[PDB]
From a paper:
All four isoforms of α-actinin consist of an N-terminal actin binding domain (ABD) comprising two calponin homology (CH) domains, connected via a flexible linker, which allows for conformational flexibility in the ABDs, to a rod domain. Thus [name] is important in cross-linking actin and titin filaments in the Z-disc.
We were successful in obtaining crystals for the WT and both mutant ABDs and were able to solve their structures to a resolution of between 1.9 and 2.2 Å. The ABD was in the ‘closed’ conformation in all the structures, as found for other structures of the ABDs for the second striated muscle isoform ACTN3, and the two non-muscle isoforms ACTN1. From our structures of the other WT and the two mutants that do not have this N-terminus helix, this may suggest that the N-terminus is highly flexible. For both the WT and A119T mutant structure, Val112 is orientated towards the interior of the molecule packing the side chain into a hydrophobic region. The measured Kd for the WT construct of 7.5 μM, is comparable to that measured for other ACTN ABDs [∼1 μM for smooth muscle ACTN (ACTN1), and 5 μM for Acanthamoeba ACTN]. Thermal denaturation experiments showed that the thermal stability for both mutants was lower than that for the WT construct.
Author numbering: 19 to 257
């Protein structure tokens, strides 16, 4: 059988940029909450398949108890646990499309990422409201107001606007000028600018280093779900 197939099989071990980014960011986001429950996940495509840490995540971020988990390794107990996590998200206003317990238990990557995004959106971004603007659009207007003074920043979206890292440094500088010497930063060191903001955010604001920096700089259009997840932590930290 052909060498050509074998080489392309190996090539499937590279995740597309959008997955790398969502994987890194949504894993760190889940972990910055699960640590209040004394646990962590390591691999987002594997560690929600039994429904247990998913139910716990939902409890930690909602503050409300979910019904008791099924105990037992049998596959229908994992299905019952994930159904409880998804029924709880539904009950909180999220209309789920193309997402079901069966594919989550089977490790479906796009579906598992999509589910976690619906959680991040509902419990971190949905209720953001600035000047009669809610959710994604409200978080964006917020970023625009905070960064308006900064002439080397133009927040117009949750992707390309954020590539050079200056948008992140400005959000910090506006709220905490003591923490950053903004005037010394420029557009030629985007990787530096990103890792700097993330290092400052981690040390002083308790926000883990969620972003895939290399991919943000090098990908034509960064993943906006990942960037919204990270920026949503700055909003909660500053408001």
């Amino acid at each position: 059988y052909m060498i050509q197939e074998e080489e392309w099989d190996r090539d499937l071990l590279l995740d597309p940029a959008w997955e790398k980014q969502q994987r890194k960011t949504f894993t760190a986001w889940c972990n910055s909450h699960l640590r209040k429950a004394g646990t962590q996940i390591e691999n987002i495509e594997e560690d929600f398949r039994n429904g247990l840490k998913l139910m716990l995540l939902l409890e930690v971020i909602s503050g409300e108890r979910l019904p008791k988990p099924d105990r037992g390794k049998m596959r229908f107990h994992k299905i019952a646990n994930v159904n409880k996590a998804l029924d709880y998200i539904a009950s909180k206003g999220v209309k789920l499309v193309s997402i079901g317990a069966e594919e989550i238990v089977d490790g479906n990557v796009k579906m598992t990422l999509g589910m976690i995004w619906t959680i991040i959106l509902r419990f971190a971004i949905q209720d953001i409201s600035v000047e009669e603007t809610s959710a994604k659009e409200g978080l964006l207007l917020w970023c625009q107001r905070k960064t308006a003074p900064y002439r080397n920043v133009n927040i117009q979206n949750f992707h390309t606007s954020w590539k050079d890292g200056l948008g992140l440094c400005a959000l910090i500088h506006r709220h905490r000028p003591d923490l950053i010497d903004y005037s010394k930063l420029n557009k030629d060191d985007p990787i530096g600018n990103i890792n700097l903001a993330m290092e400052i955010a981690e040390k002083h604001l308790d926000i883990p280093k969620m972003l895939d920096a290399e991919d943000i700089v090098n990908t034509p259009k960064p993943d906006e779900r990942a960037i919204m997840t990270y920026v949503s932590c700055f909003y909660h930290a500053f408001a």
